[PDB]
Design a protein around this ligand. Structure first.
Ligand SMILES: Nc1nc2c(ncn2[C@@H]2O[C@H](COP(=O)(O)OP(=O)(O)OP(=O)(O)O)[C@@H](O)[C@H]2O)c(=O)[nH]1
Ligand SMILES: Nc1nc2c(ncn2[C@@H]2O[C@H](COP(=O)(O)OP(=O)(O)OP(=O)(O)O)[C@@H](O)[C@H]2O)c(=O)[nH]1
Ligand SMILES: [Mg+2]
Lengths: 918, 339
DNA sequence: AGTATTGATATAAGTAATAGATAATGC
DNA sequence: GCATTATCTACCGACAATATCAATACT
């Protein structure tokens, strides 16, 4: 039964609320069944389909054949392990499996049911297709690790269910791999598939049986890569009509209210526990998050996440019908690539041709293969989404959120959510419906104008556009297919279709103010990354250029750069240039958007070339391998914007210099005793700061400590999560300028979400884009401006500088100075002092160790004890007399640069600007 | 006649870019006597020699002194050595070209577009009598270049479209050990197979006494290289070097399928052939077990296989009805972004 | 006398691939 | 001491080399 049909039919909010409460009490059981006994449902579907096919969907028939044939081997494998564990000790055993290997992974196999293990391994292999960059398969290490992690998750769900029904802590990756290797090594020999071949000599067609999966190796730039490959028959099976129940996600959206976030390790799903941060690679992030959660410094983060999570959604109906009709057509559409069977490759050049020609042909073939596979992947993903929305039609679904290590919120359900592409954004609406009122109609018109790409004009122009095109709106909404299909011309078609639906229903009425509209209306920040620099350095020109100060018409930075580049090319194309004539009119704000965006984040020349090259292909100004225009365009873009953002570049360079200085600092405690590896020590200090909302941000960039661990298939090259390694001084200097700004944006989003949730709105955010009902846009805008003013009223660059200074007090850098410079000369005298008392020449480690105890002496609570220690003058203590530190090797204090001067800009003046968010 | 550079002159150059050159005229005279170029080039007066990476150019001076070919072209672009070449060899028949041998374009841009150096094409049944190539790729960085040229031998496209062009190559001793490894030795790899299939390489000289222990004990008997020491090469801060005479030979096999089969067989070079063929495709072990009657071949590891057996396995692979597509054997990672 | 880690070297071959930071070296 | 050559990575967002082998370490 489709409960959404009943919900809209009720007359008054009282009956609706009673029905919703009863529905939640009912849906608790459905959610509990869904989370715990989902794989048994897949087994039941496999068995049913097999029985039906035998009595009188081909993929489901085969899967039960493998699972029923794999199961005997697993029961034999576990029995062998238990035999060795039954006997206490056996000194002499064959090194093959019984000596150590079956003792290594013995206990971990005995945990869960063998049939469950078979189901998990089949599902995990079938999900990992065309991942890691293998053409028709996957990487072996990722496959075995994923299988092991899935087995562990199933064990902990079963364990918690047993513990809460009757009334190591985490597996090492040297143990997770072996379980997956054993299961996959059984499945490789179990699986079979039927293939049709053509004889090369006699040209006689034959049939045969071949293993479904195989294991091989491949090489990229002089390095092997173990891969698992899938027969083409399975691949072409995986692009059929639909896949009803064979591969169902284990982390699909909830049916009831999510568990509120009350701690850093408790929230989200009922039977499943999820950590606040997505980055589980580093342990230091976990340590700092636990420390900050114990006190309770991040209550605002909890509030924002709770407000985001508890928004009820529901699957759109009419758009689902339209998509179902388009999918059944079997032909390529707006973005659905269509079912292509065989791909096309140009004829190979004669082998006598110059090697450059053959290399170019190989590059072209590589490009063609990536497109064909990228298209197949898109089609399969669209089919999977249409599967997920099918079973959830007319159902209430909630999206819990978590964070990455900076603060940006991401839904837990990876496949079907509102962060997906345009089609996924089209199949979702709000369950709670609001009357349009005097403003909802205008805001819905503005939303349609936004979705049609015309969101750079004033508001009156957008309303005029929609009022003019009302006829096409009705024409496209009545019959989406076999009509004029005006909604296909839109920049975002699968949302403009729903907007046209709602506008048509509205205009078929006589009173717009009585309609209940469920369509979310976006409000995206314009040049958000530059808005944060404008508010940080207090630049008036920068604030004007990013729609901060009140104005009359929208201003943007990317269109300005596009016009500059266009006139540059036009001048160039008028003096006889050949490439500029082609690119004379092909430059728009979309082509030059991400290069202007990421210039202030530190984008490289080659990264910019690939950005612009990726952006050229959708308009096919050239072909896929015509990347030589992109180099010219990026050179012109950099030349044009060489002298545009100066206030922003100052903060970018300050953050870069600060990160470089921190990454080369040594604390006195870590250098407790020389490692004797070398005179130079290791650097283990990362860059850490705190969000304005209290959250700690630790950059997890450290050198890799990978090693090869043997499995049944191969020896996989994996890392040690517990290892602490010297920091990556290249990525610490490159990640700070983007990470700081993204954390600022995330904090602003969390503040705004919390306030809007308290005020009663339905809220949902996508980075800089915030959604709400068509009738709540004015209140939401007021909240946005108020929270931005609250965030940026206090100086943040200076606060960051003070926090760094108070976090890295007793940290020492290493540098060089002239042996005859008087400042450096005096240390040599101190270097001579240890020759008698210590008995040996003074060294770097000893000089550092000397100051370690003096800090304890300085902080001794006794005043008499302070005089004992404070009188000493160490090598570091020489520099305390002066401050001009810029102008052998000597230790130096960790001094951070001066903050860029702050301009005279008032942040409150934006509270009346109506183009800040639009 | 030609003023040969001396030790007192090549000692002033500051940068050698990792390359090491021999400068003792006695060793060159012994080498050029051992090579015996007069038994294959009947008329050196009509000979064109292309010399790549000459460096100091002492070998070029001696070679021109002894034989006096009609055209001797040096391709060098590294600035420090180019200055020395330009200054020392002024007013000489040797012509110096400021182009980089690494690029694929330069050769064409110098042989077809502007006809600076046009050789004489000959048939593919005898060693070309109007074309000799001399190369000095000694740096550890420039090892892929040797393999690219060695594959261009098989493609007959780069400089071997003129015939069986003979090359005299200076290369690191480790590269010589890898290339000249007979079946079963510790140094056997895929480059040894390529050398076996495409070339008949003979070691001429080596600059270390101990390095001979790595090579095959028997084969040295048939070669007797001209042993010298590391005191006659100027940049002594490197590794021992070696000289080899390469010349193409005919063949009849599918280059692409043979390349695929050898590449995917030599990864597991020590596992027995009983279970290494399972990596050449989906269900390849059963097919190759059905089509190999003798059980002896299925016992030898890929490190023990002679190139003839590799060609036999290639022929078995080509007649397989269910052979995979060898074109799509690559990893696309920078290119691929998965939603 | 015996296995068992443990570090080192080769692998393909223009890495898509080119520009700028950063380390290194020689006289 | 500075100046030319060598090495390395590619803005951020949770996801990746492997086999063979001497060589010593060490039950
Ligand atoms: N470092 C980095 N940040 C990005 C990138 N793309 C988007 N962002 C960030 O995510 C935000 C999303 O903004 P968008 O709506 O995509 O674009 P915009 O800069 O606001 O400009 P408009 O298109 O005018 O809205 C940006 O402002 C950046 O802060 C990228 O490639 N690199
Ligand atoms: N952090 C980060 N986010 C990105 C990057 N590229 C895209 N995104 C995000 O992906 C989202 C989808 O981008 P689009 O497909 O262009 O859709 P959109 O958000 O409406 O942006 P426009 O179409 O340009 O208006 C954006 O909102 C970005 O926030 C990136 O490189 N880094
Ligand atoms: Mg934006």
């Amino acid at each position: 039964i489709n409960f959404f049909e009943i919900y809209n039919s009720l007359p008054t909010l009282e009956e609706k609320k009673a029905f919703e409460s009863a529905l939640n009490i009912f849906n608790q059981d459905r959610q509990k069944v869904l989370e715990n006994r989902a794989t048994e449902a897949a087994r039941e579907r496999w068995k049913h389909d097999f029985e039906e096919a035998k009595a009188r969907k081909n993929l489901n028939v085969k899967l039960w054949k493998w699972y029923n044939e794999m199961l005997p081997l697993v029961k034999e494998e576990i029995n062998h392990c238990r035999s060795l564990l039954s006997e206490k000790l056996s000194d002499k055993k064959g090194l093959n499996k019984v000596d150590t290997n079956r003792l290594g992974y013995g206990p971990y196999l005995t945990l869960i049911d063998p049939g469950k293990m078979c189901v998990i391994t089949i599902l995990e292999l079938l999900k990992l297709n065309s991942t890691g960059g293998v053409i028709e398969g996957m990487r072996t290490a990722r496959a075995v690790i994923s299988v092991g992690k899935a087995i562990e998750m199933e064990f902990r769900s079963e364990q918690v269910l047993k513990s809460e029904s009757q009334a190591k802590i985490l597996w090492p990756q040297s143990i997770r791999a072996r379980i997956g290797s054993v299961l996959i090594s059984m499945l490789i020999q179990v699986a079979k598939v039927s293939v049709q071949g053509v004889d090369p000599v006699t040209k006689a067609k034959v049939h045969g049986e071949a293993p479904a999966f195989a294991h091989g190796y491949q090489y990229h730039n002089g390095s092997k890569l173990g891969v698992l490959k899938i027969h083409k028959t399975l691949i072409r099976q995986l692009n059929g009509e639909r896949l009803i129940a064979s591969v169902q996600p284990q982390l699909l959206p909830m049916l009831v209210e999510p568990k509120p976030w009350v701690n850093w390790r408790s929230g989200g799903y009922h039977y499943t526990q999820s950590t606040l941060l997505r980055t589980k690679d580093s342990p230091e992030q976990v340590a700092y998050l636990k420390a900050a959660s114990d006190n309770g410094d991040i209550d605002r983060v909890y509030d924002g996440l709770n407000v985001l999570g508890r928004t009820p959604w529901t699957v759109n109906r009419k758009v689902f019908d339209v998509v179902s009709q388009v999918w059944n057509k079997g032909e390529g559409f707006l973005d659905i690539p269509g079912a292509q069977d065989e791909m096309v490759l140009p004829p190979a050049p004669p082998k006598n041709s110059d090697p450059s020609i053959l290399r170019a042909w190989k590059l072209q073939v590589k490009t063609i293969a990536n497109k064909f596979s990228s298209d197949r992947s898109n089609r399969c993903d669209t089919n999977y989404k249409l599967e997920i929305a099918r079973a959830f039609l007319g159902e209430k679904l909630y999206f819990p959120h978590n964070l990455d290590f900076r603060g940006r919120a991401y839904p837990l359900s990876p496949h079907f959510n509102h962060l997906g592409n345009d089609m996924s954004r089209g199949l979702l609406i709000f369950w709670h419906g609001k009357k349009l009122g005097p403003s909802g109609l205008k805001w819905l018109k503005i939303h349609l104008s936004n979705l049609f790409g015309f969101d750079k004009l004033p508001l009156k122009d957008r309303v005029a556009f929609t009022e003019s095109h009302l006829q096409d709106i009705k024409d496209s909404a009545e019959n989406p297919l076999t009509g004029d299909r005006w909604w296909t011309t839109a920049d975002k078609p699968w949302q403009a279709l729903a907007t046209c639906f709602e506008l048509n229903e509205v205009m078929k009425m006589d009173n717009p103010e009585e309609f209940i509209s469920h369509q979310p209306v976006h409000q995206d920040g314009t040049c958000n990354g530059l808005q944060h620099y404008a508010a940080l350095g207090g630049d008036v020109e920068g604030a004007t250029q990013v729609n901060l100060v009140p104005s009359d018409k929208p201003q943007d930075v990317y269109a300005h750069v596009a016009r500059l580049v266009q006139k540059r090319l036009e001048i160039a194309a008028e003096k006889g240039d050949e490439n500029a004539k082609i690119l004379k009119d092909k430059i728009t704000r979309k082509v030059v958007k991400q290069t202007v965006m990421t210039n202030v984040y530190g984008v490289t020349y080659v990264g910019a070339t690939f950005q612009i090259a990726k952006q050229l292909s959708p308009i096919f100004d050239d072909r896929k391998e015509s990347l030589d225009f992109s180099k010219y365009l990026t050179k012109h873009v950099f030349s044009a914007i060489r002298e545009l953002f100066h206030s922003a570049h100052l903060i970018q360079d300050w953050l870069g210099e600060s990160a470089k200085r921190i990454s080369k600092s040594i604390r006195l405690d870590v250098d407790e005793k020389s490692f004797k590896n070398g005179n130079k020590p290791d650097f283990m200090s990362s860059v850490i700061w705190t969000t304005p909302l209290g959250l700690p941000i630790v950059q997890p960039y450290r050198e890799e400590s990978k090693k090869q661990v043997e499995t049944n298939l191969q020896t996989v090259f994996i890392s040690d999560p517990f290892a602490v390694n010297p920091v990556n001084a290249r990525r610490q200097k490159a990640g700070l300028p983007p990470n700081f700004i993204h954390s600022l944006d995330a904090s602003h989003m969390l503040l705004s979400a919390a306030e809007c949730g308290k005020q009663g709105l339905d809220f949902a955010s996508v980075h800089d884009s915030y959604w709400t009902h068509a009738s709540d846009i004015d209140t939401m805008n007021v909240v946005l401006r108020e929270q931005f003013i609250k965030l940026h009223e206090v100086d943040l660059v200076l606060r960051l500088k003070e926090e760094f200074d108070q976090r890295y007090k007793n940290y020492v850098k290493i540098g060089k100075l002239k042996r005859s410079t008087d400042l450096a000369q005096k240390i040599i005298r101190i270097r001579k002092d240890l020759s008698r008392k210590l008995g040996r020449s003074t060294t770097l480690a000893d000089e550092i160790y000397f100051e370690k105890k003096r800090q304890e002496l300085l902080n001794s609570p006794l005043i008499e004890d302070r005089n004992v220690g404070e009188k000493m003058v160490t090598t570091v203590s020489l520099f305390e007399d002066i401050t001009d530190l810029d102008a052998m090797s000597v230790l130096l204090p960790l001094r951070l640069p001066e903050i860029p001067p702050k301009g005279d800009f008032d942040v409150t003046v934006l509270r009346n600007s109506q183009y800040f968010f639009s | 006649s030609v003023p040969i550079p001396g030790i007192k002159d090549i000692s002033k150059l500051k940068f050698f870019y990792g390359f090491k050159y021999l400068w003792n005229p006695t060793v060159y005279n012994k080498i050029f006597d051992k090579l015996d170029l007069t038994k294959t080039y009947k008329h050196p007066e009509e000979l064109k020699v292309l010399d790549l990476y000459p460096g100091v150019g002492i070998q070029s001076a001696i070679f021109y002194n002894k034989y006096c070919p009609r055209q001797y072209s040096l391709l060098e672009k590294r600035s420090s050595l180019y200055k020395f070449l330009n200054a020392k060899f002024e007013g000489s028949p040797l012509q110096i070209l400021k182009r980089d041998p690494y690029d694929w374009s330069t050769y064409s841009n110098l042989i077809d577009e502007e006809r600076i150096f046009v050789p004489e094409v000959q048939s593919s049944d005898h060693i070309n009598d109007k074309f000799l190539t001399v190369a000095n790729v000694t740096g550890e960085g420039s090892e892929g270049l040797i393999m690219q040229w060695l594959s261009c031998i098989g493609n007959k496209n780069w400089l071997y479209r003129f015939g069986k062009v003979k090359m005299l190559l200076w290369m690191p001793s480790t590269t010589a050990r890898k290339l000249l490894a007979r079946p079963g030795m510790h140094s056997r790899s895929k480059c040894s197979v390529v050398r076996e299939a495409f070339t008949d390489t003979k070691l001429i000289a080596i600059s270390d006494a101990n390095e001979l222990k790595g090579f095959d004990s028997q084969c040295i008997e048939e070669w007797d290289p001209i042993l010298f020491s590391a005191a006659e090469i100027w940049p002594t801060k490197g590794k021992p070097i070696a000289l080899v005479e390469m010349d193409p030979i005919d063949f009849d096999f599918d280059v692409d399928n043979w390349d695929y089969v050898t590449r995917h067989l030599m990864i597991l070079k020590r596992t027995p052939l009983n279970t290494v063929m399972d990596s050449l495709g989906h269900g390849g072990q059963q097919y190759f077990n059905s089509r190999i009657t003798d059980k002896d071949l299925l016992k030898k590891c890929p490190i023990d296989l002679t190139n003839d057996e590799f060609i036999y396995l290639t022929k078995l692979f080509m007649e397989w009805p269910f052979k995979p597509d060898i074109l799509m054997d690559f990893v696309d990672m920078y290119q691929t972004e998965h939603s």
